[PDB]
Amino acid sequence: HTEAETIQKLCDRVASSTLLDDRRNAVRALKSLSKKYRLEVGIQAMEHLIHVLQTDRSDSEIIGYALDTLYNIISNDEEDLGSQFTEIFIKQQENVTLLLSLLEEFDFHVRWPGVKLLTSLLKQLGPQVQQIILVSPMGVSRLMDLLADSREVIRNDGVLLLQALTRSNGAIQKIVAFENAFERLLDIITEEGNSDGGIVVEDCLILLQNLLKNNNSNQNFFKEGSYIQRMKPWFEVGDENSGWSAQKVTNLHLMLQLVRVLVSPNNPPGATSSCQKAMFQCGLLQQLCTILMATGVPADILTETINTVSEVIRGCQVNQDYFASVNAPSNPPRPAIVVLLMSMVNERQPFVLRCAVLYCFQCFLYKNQKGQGEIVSTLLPSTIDATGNTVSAGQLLCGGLFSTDSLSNWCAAVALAHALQENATQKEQLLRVQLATSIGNPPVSLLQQCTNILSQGSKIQTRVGLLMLLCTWLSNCPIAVTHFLHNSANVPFLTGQIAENLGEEEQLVQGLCALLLGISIYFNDNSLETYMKEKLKQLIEKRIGKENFIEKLGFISKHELYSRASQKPQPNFPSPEYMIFDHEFTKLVKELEGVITKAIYKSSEEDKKEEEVK
């Protein structure tokens, strides 16, 4: 009965006794038992503790202890009982709005544990408790007053409460922004010394990400409110004095994240465009770029600053044109793009950096036909000649394309593919590129050499890279398709690969050969005699079987790695073995998989009608 009925007796007191002192004492006893006998105190004490909160409001002290005891029952912040009791506490709507009332009180011993309790509830039944507060009249606004509390333990734990209130809840994120959240949280971060400001800067950065991430209205306010310029001082860093703390790197990671959130490729493209421009004009883009010249910067901060710059420029000419204008101070001063490509094909750089550098290269080229022409024309040199050395973009791409490192081959092929992407003009130009073979042997075009590599016992990653280039190059480009089929070795290589009984490690390659062949049909103009289109269909029927051809084509989208690649532009590869798919390439596969599939069926009698009907 003692350690069991003992609690029952303390409960009789709180319920039954008329002297505030007797009740108060008994709640303080429970406050201490609450830790070691969490289950027992909760099952018996809870109804009673709430009654105290309802009826003993003149005695701040006893309230402070009812709350302390409740926190102790409900909280899993230490670590089941947490949600079990949270469900019981909240099943009466009014128990939470009561809690709201109690936080309007100034007494440290009432408000602090109130804050901590409500936070524990919001992290355990978020949606439910957020909804109770949202519908309460001005419930969210009043909780916002906790940021005006001069006391620090209260204000700081108040930020943590707003994290929990705001999480996954767009209506609340808007109200919180309405109530001056941005100005006030940026001021706290400014006052704590930006990235140097310890734990509280982190929880304010976390809270800001809750407010902006995928929340279009708040992002727009953030921009219209001119709050982007407040981001600029965060990145006046690096410099030197290279003992950065764990907390500083952590804080600056969260800061780079907020910038990227505002220029996310998944946003409505107007909003990202607007923020890109806003970033070029307050100097934020240019500041970040400076982080990348400095010494002292930790590698992973370097790595994410590159990924951030990438998205600040993506598809925005002034910002792309700017980025290219920058030059690193070095014996050869080297343009920015040249510098990215050197790191991308450097076997000695970490994988994570090599992927950031590629992404940056790709964002540079996106919707940028001038930049796309500038890359391609360095492979057709004319009005540049020997100064006694110098190293060019196209030289680095070729060096990577035919290198011994499958990572370099893959990166060089995808980087080239982004130079051709939605640019027929440059696909025609790249067909002009000729490679020297040996002293006194004819040259081989870049097109044919990329194709030759697929039959030479190359690693599967090299072959995947190259076939993506090849598919991108021929797609939507009939003279590409003409030049390709013109070499008689190519259609038989493809048909033999597609027909072969290849093991599972080679089936992605097999499927990409299906797509390339099918591109050479769909985008065929019939201008070449001996591989028209109907010839090619019948060759598929004869050698592979139409159904089998389509099955193999279907391997591309069923590859275990495809889906993930389709989610966003940034390379998302946990390690080298996962570098297989490119994001824009997954889009090409979706646009064409279906139209090739009909194209390929539909018989000859239909086809001469179809080649009369168009």
Place this chain on the structure above:
Amino acid sequence: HTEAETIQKLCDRVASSTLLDDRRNAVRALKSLSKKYRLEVGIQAMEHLIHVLQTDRSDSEIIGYALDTLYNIISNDEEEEDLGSQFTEIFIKQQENVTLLLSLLEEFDFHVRWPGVKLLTSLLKQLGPQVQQIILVSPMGVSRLMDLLADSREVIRNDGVLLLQALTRSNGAIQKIVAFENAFERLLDIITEEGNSDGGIVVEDCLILLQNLLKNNNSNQNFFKEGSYIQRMKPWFEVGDENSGWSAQKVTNLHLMLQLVRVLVSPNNPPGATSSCQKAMFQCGLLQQLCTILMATGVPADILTETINTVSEVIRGCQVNQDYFASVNAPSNPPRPAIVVLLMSMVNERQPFVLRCAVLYCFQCFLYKNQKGQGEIVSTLLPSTIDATGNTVSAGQLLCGGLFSTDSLSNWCAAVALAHALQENATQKEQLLRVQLATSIGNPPVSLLQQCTNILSQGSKIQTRVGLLMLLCTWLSNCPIAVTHFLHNSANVPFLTGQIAENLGEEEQLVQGLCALLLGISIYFNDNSLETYMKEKLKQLIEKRIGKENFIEKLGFISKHELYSRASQKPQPNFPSPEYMIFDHEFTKLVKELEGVITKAIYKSSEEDKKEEE
């Protein structure tokens, strides 16, 4: 010099010297220094070692010394997955060097043939596509190599099985020849001779070689079956009843035997092939023998699991085989029909994850294209026709039980099992609407349809909700009457629009996209019988409260989820641990089927919808 000229004198000696005995010792010297200074011994001895083989054939002592050395230079068999492939390249640069090796294998002498076989096997492991094509083109190369299986010296035959593995890997042409040359009979006899699964490494190797000949090779599969070889598998699974003590090698051998059965009934085969084999397997009693294993004792966990997966494919889509499996019972405590034993283990929190996935696959294979079976599951949820002797759990009870369990695995499995009872069966989709669940004394029934939906707002685990929505989507697709029953409850449409419009975090975006698909299905298969939520009202609500392009982004999260492509590959559930149990294979096809058309149905206008309503 005194380390590398100690090589070149010998080379000079092998070439220069005119006495056989002198050259022979020159070569014997070199051999014993081969697997020791590989690099240098390879870089200059190789052209002379070949010359030797190419002329000194009357003396088979020096030939085996030449072959041994050459194996020590080329082989990487020591190294357990460099110089190996550097020298294989050099060696095969002369087409004829390989065909000269094939000539040496015809020699009976043990000291020539055995290094010959090991050397040719190493070349094939290291550059298979090249070496395989050399051998295939030469006058009856493959055919001659088959003779090695007929060698009465075990060592040579056993290592000849390995050569045939490397010769046939990934090569459909060589696979055909080896089959035509009586490979099946001759490997099935070896297996029978060495005593089936108890026949050690030799049987493991013949099982791999059979797998090479059968997997994804339709012509070879068709020949395996027409030639009555399926009945040669039956003895392999007379794996007698009791106390265990199975060796590691016995379990390996059985795993590979089970894999061969599955090869023949693969869902990835043309359906005819698979169907014909399934029949063939019932007729010779193979299905029955595999089912006997499931009842036995002392059967290791892993062989049990894989037998379940094997039986699954044997019965999948074959009515007679499905009827047979259904009619088997355990004797257990009282009886228990097979289906019920599967379902009990599926909903058993203490069964292994892999075992729980196996029984699910089995159940799904029992229902596939089996409308009768689908009917019998669903009719048990309508318990009419049946009363109790107290005890006797049914299929339905266990499915409902699991569907409301606390364990999310059981919820997902119960919901998926249930979705397979409805597939392509409008009749049962309409019958399941009749199911009414009891709540509590004096209170209204809650239908199963609506109760499945309720769970989605009740703070359930993500896995629980993913399962339930796959079920709801399957249930409503092509069932206008189920779309009516769903919409009719007024809380359902506001709940979905709410979920889709909310700023949910990444861990919940699959559920959000599934809510969109659900909402889209109730628009696409609406017949306008329900005035409150007609087709056109719903299209407008989407615009109002979420935005159409937004709705499609959400709808698009399903195919983009990282685990989606993998699930789309094959029928068997493919989950490395419990957290990965997310998508059902057949559901992924529903998504491919409806997304383009839903997307297209949503956009249009209203004016056009008058004429789509026309």
